């Protein structure tokens, strides 16, 4: 190409030498012809040794790579720019992936010139700033280095950056003409406070390490194979003790099975260059295929020592990891890691809404996974927010906070969680009226805006004492023992509060104490007398305390009451329940005591146990109109609770009036069913409230867990059993009854009839179920069979016809073999 | 605790900040007192030999570091004297790194002074670690250190009479065993003084 | 402020060798405050500059 081509001719006039050979370019100068000082070996230089003279003949400093410079900058330009909405995890995986590919072999080539190294600041700057653009934040204080880098499941994107560095720029153009000096090198990292990140360049192997590596290692394997050839074979673990990982020609690679035995003589460079110029794209292969060569890029101390430089457990404490890990304290060992990549999605390419919603959760997982972004108060445009009916402090991204946090908080029931902790203290205090001689203890009216106002105080419950609460300084709950004055006036009443924010920086002492002295100093709402007890709790990392007066019979009382109550609260059951539900990553324990076998025998004794199948709550009629479109019109459903011992069946019918105006009717059937079951439980006096509830669906499990928080005695469990309440339904009862149902109403049903008199509840239960799946397949032939004689009749007030026990047995055999036939 | 955290930050910044010659601004920016200077030199050598391979950045950081102040090069002389007491206590793979760093600083010769006298143990008394490492550092330091000017200039520097095993003439085992070990290690004509003197 | 009139870089191999010298006098490391108050000390881009207030 003439002028486009480059060449260099060394001679007596040219003091040094150079060339463009291979990538980047090369330079060398002899140590004898160098007049100034001697050869200075620091970073970019190289040792040129003469094997004939057995010494270092010259010093070779080569170059940086301009074509690879613009190739990496353009590779990140099309990489990040061509990448649209998607999970930042894989985005940083390809980012740091290919960036490490260009950083695979750099050493003195990239370390020499600072211009190529300066592009990495724009690389990582546009990377973390690109993820911040995806979060619609772009705030430096909202994304410290903690969320920038972390390996594996630690919560970080896994980006490996060599940001924290200062290029050796000295004396500007004066040194551009001088080319000798080191002073005032660049600036530093992007944002670093009293800390320095790791560097892959310092953790990589220089070309000299490959020189001496393959040299001394080539002599070790050389003489080893020599003496093995002259003497006997002796091929054993000694080669593994020879450090086969040293050098690019790794001995472990040539000693493999498919490598030495398989493949072939001609190397893989053919498909390397050719295929690199072929197919649909190229790749970052600077040496050879993984089969022909290897033992080059190994994380090791990069990820290990990276987590070592990271805060580790302290870093998770600075993040929201340990916050949601409060109740699952054993989750700190990274047991279940994460899951749910495929989930229910069909293949990969799908509708744009299914792809955006598919990338929603992981973006929301990494978004809501870091609280301090929307929690820790920052400068500039940071503003106050009220969230939804709970509270908020710092502003931030709309989808993270509102979308993810509202889904984690579920419905307004969080107010019933606060009132569930207050009522949990009121009901948790019983012997205190006898011990403290409380004259009158009455819970104050709980307003919906009282617990929702973070500025003002909160009224919990009212109590009394013989004289009054004995105490002097209303310090915090964690305060040490101090002299307690009497100061008896009238009475006292405990208060409560909660804080869902302040991930990184939070203090229950200063904020609880100073908050009680603040709201108590001014006049907003004061439930107790001027001498009283005020309790303040924080939802972050399961924090609880009290800023009120600590009495000798109060501080230990509410102390241990907050030890067990704060240990497991119903509101804390919703905290770990909805917490881990929103995480959907690490679950170290399964559910329990899910019904399997012994629950059938325990279903008939003297306890509770309810079977709830909502499958038929949602029923529709799909009819295609002749325009070519489907019209779906919902019809009335029903909600089911069955008693195995007594055969008592509960009927709650759902109507198109409450099916009207809403959407997502399956999930709405879940929440509506669980809410109605909760109301019925509240309506069947505590004796008629169940001990356990058996359901057939996890979509039954979660909403019941949400609505049932106010009765901790109730235990929720799932089951795989098959109960065609649908078959029965149509059959006779809800064919006529749901077909005719004009509105929601409720009726007590006995499905065993006289079986309880004739037979045991277990025989009625198993016979019941077998005859149920019967009532499907033979519902068809149960409407055939169940009247074996012409005079067989069903009484109007029973479920079943009257038959002799032998005929019942015949029905058992016929319908059981039916179930076997399917 | 102070040396554990100081070694954690020194190792964190050691594994980071490529071209450690620039990292000396951060190492000196730590502002460690004189009590942490000796422990920073010993732990600095521990991090130098803790790598999976010999790194020239450790030799440069030791050359500029020890070459900074007087107590620095002094800490390199005393720390090198304490390093000479390792012998068989040093690791086999780390012996090559100690020979590469000691050979790099010995090639410059600035900070080390009496290190040439502390070496060269007796004829038949050795741990083979200082003999093998002395052969590796003697071959590499002979190649890159200008062996003809290093041995010829070292003959008039009074380093040989200050060393026990390098003493020619009187002691027959020192000069003879030094000629057999030197000539057997590849010194060639460098042992002719002990050969003719013996 | 900004680079102002300067775009990125403008130089020449023959102009730099004529203006500067590989071997020259070295006394002080080119104090910027000396060139600030002395527009003749810094000849790079002397266009639209209000300066040279002598002493007090």
């Amino acid at each position: 190409q003439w002028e486009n081509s480059f060449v260099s001719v060394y001679s007596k006039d040219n003091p040094n030498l150079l060339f463009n050979m291979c990538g980047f370019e090369c330079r060398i100068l002899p140590k004898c012809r160098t007049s100034y000082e001697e050869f200075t070996h620091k970073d970019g230089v190289w040792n040129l040794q003469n094997e004939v003279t057995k010494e270092r003949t010259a010093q070779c400093f080569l170059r940086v790579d301009d074509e690879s410079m613009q190739r990496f900058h353009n590779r990140v330009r099309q990489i990040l720019m061509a990448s649209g909405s998607t999970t930042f995890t894989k985005i940083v995986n390809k980012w740091n992936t290919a960036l490490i590919g260009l950083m695979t072999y750099f050493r003195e080539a990239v370390v020499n010139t600072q211009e190529l190294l300066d592009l990495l600041v724009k690389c990582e700057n546009k990377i973390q700033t690109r993820i911040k653009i995806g979060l619609n934040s772009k705030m430096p204080s909202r994304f410290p280095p903690v969320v920038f880098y972390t390996p594996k499941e630690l919560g970080g994107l896994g980006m490996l950056s060599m940001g924290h560095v200062l290029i050796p720029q000295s004396d500007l153009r004066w040194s551009k003409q001088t080319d000798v000096g080191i002073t005032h090198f660049r600036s530093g990292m992007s944002h670093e406070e009293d800390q320095l990140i790791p560097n892959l360049y310092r953790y990589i192997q220089p070309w000299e390490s490959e020189f001496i590596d393959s040299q001394r290692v080539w002599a070790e394997y050389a003489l080893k194979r020599q003496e093995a050839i002259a003497q006997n074979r002796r091929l054993t673990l000694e080669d593994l003790e020879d450090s086969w990982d040293r050098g690019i020609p790794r001995i472990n690679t040539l000693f493999q099975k498919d490598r030495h035995t398989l493949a072939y003589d001609k190397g893989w460079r053919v498909r390397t260059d050719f295929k690199q110029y072929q197919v649909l794209k190229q790749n970052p292969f600077w040496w050879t295929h993984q089969r022909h060569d290897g033992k080059l890029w190994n994380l090791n101390n990069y990820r290990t020592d990276m987590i070592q430089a990271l805060g580790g457990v302290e870093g998770i404490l600075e993040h929201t990891l340990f916050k949601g890990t409060y109740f699952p304290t054993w989750e700190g060992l990274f047991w279940e890691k994460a899951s749910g990549f495929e989930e229910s999605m069909k293949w990969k390419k799908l509708t744009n809404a299914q792809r955006s919603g598919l990338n929603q959760i992981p973006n929301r997982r990494f978004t809501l996974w870091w609280s301090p972004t929307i929690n820790r108060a920052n400068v500039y445009v940071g503003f106050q927010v009220q969230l939804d009916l709970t509270g908020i402090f710092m502003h931030g991204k709309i989808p993270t906070l509102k979308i993810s946090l509202i889904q984690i908080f579920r419905a307004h029931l969080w107010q019933k969680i606060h009132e569930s902790i207050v009522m949990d203290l009121c009901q948790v205090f019983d012997q205190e009226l006898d011990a403290l001689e409380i004259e009158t203890v009455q819970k104050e009216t709980i307003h919906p805006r009282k617990s929702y106002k973070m500025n003002s105080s909160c009224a919990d419950i009212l109590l009394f004492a013989s004289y009054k609460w004995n105490v002097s300084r209303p310090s915090l709950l964690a305060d040490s023992k101090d002299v307690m004055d009497s100061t008896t006036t009238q009475k006292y009443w405990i208060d409560i509060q909660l804080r869902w924010g302040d991930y990184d920086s939070h203090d229950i002492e200063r904020y609880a104490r100073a908050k009680f002295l603040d709201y108590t100093t001014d006049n907003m709402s004061i439930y107790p007398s001027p001498t009283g007890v005020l309790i303040a709790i924080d939802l972050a990392y399961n924090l609880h305390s009290a800023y009120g007066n600590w009495f000798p019979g109060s501080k230990p009382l509410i102390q241990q009451a907050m030890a067990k109550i704060m240990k497991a609260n119903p509101a804390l059951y919703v905290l770990r329940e909805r917490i881990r539900k929103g995480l959907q990553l690490y679950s170290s324990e399964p559910t329990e005591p899910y019904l399997s076998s012994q629950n059938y025998g325990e279903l008939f004794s003297n306890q509770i146990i309810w079977f709830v199948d909502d499958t038929n709550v949602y029923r529709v009629t799909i009819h295609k109109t002749f325009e070519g479109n489907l019209t779906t019109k919902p019809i009335n459903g029903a909600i089911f609770i069955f008693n195995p011992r007594t055969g008592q069946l509960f009927l709650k019918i759902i109507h198109t009036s409450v099916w009207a105006g809403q959407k997502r009717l399956g999930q709405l059937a879940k929440w509506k069913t669980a809410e109605e079951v909760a109301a019925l439980i509240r309506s069947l006096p505590v004796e008629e409230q169940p001990k356990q509830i058996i359901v057939t669906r996890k979509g039954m499990l979660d909403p019941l867990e949400v609505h049932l928080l106010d009765f901790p005695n109730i235990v929720i469990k799932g089951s795989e059993l098959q109960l065609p309440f649908q078959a029965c339904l149509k059959v006779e009862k809800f064919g006529d009854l749901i077909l005719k149902a004009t509105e929601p109403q409720m009726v007590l049903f006995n499905l065993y009839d006289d079986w309880l008199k004739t037979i045991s509840s277990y025989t009625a239960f198993s016979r019941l179920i077998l005859i149920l799946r019967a009532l499907h397949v033979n519902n068809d032939r149960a409407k055939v069979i169940l009247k074996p004689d012409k005079t067989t009749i069903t009484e109007p007030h029973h479920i079943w016809p009257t038959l002799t026990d032998e005929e019942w047995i015949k029905v058992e055999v016929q319908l059981k073999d039916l179930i076997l036939a399917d | 605790i102070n040396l554990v955290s100081f070694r954690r930050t020194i190792y964190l910044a050691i594994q980071s900040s490529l071209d450690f010659e620039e990292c000396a601004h951060k190492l000196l920016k730590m502002e460690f007192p004189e009590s942490q200077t000796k422990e920073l030199c010993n732990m600095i050598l521990d991090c130098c030999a803790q790598q999976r391979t010999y790194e020239k950045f450790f030799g440069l950081l030791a050359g500029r570091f020890c070459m900074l102040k007087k107590e620095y090069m002094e800490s390199f002389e005393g720390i090198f004297k304490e390093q000479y007491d390792t012998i068989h206590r040093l690791e086999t793979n780390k012996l090559r790194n100690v020979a590469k760093m000691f050979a790099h600083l010995l090639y410059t010769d600035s900070l080390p002074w009496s290190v040439l006298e502390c070496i060269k143990l007796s004829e038949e008394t050795t741990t083979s670690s200082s003999r093998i490492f002395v052969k590796i550092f003697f071959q590499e330091l002979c190649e890159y250190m200008g062996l003809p000017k290093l041995n010829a200039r070292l003959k008039d520097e009074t380093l040989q009479p200050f060393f026990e095993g390098l003493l020619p003439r009187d002691n027959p085992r020192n000069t003879r065993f030094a000629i057999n070990f030197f000539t057997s290690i590849g010194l060639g004509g460098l042992t002719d003084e002990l050969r003719e003197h013996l | 402020f900004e680079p102002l009139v300067r775009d990125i870089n403008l130089q020449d191999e023959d102009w730099n060798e004529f203006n500067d010298i590989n071997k020259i006098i070295i006394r002080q490391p080119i104090r910027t405050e000396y060139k600030i108050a002395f527009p003749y000390l810094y000849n790079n881009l002397p266009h639209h500059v209000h300066l040279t207030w002598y002493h007090t």
Binding site: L172, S187, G188, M189 | - | -
Partner: peptide
């Protein structure tokens, strides 16, 4: 742009690295 070193655009890349002289530049100068 200080004497001998500076970045025309401080907003150009990351943040202005408050460089000094490096505890090693004095060692190389002495």
């Amino acid at each position: 742009m200080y004497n001998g070193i500076g970045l025309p655009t401080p907003r150009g890349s990351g943040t202005n690295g408050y460089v000094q002289r490096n505890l090693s530049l004095v060692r190389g100068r002495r």
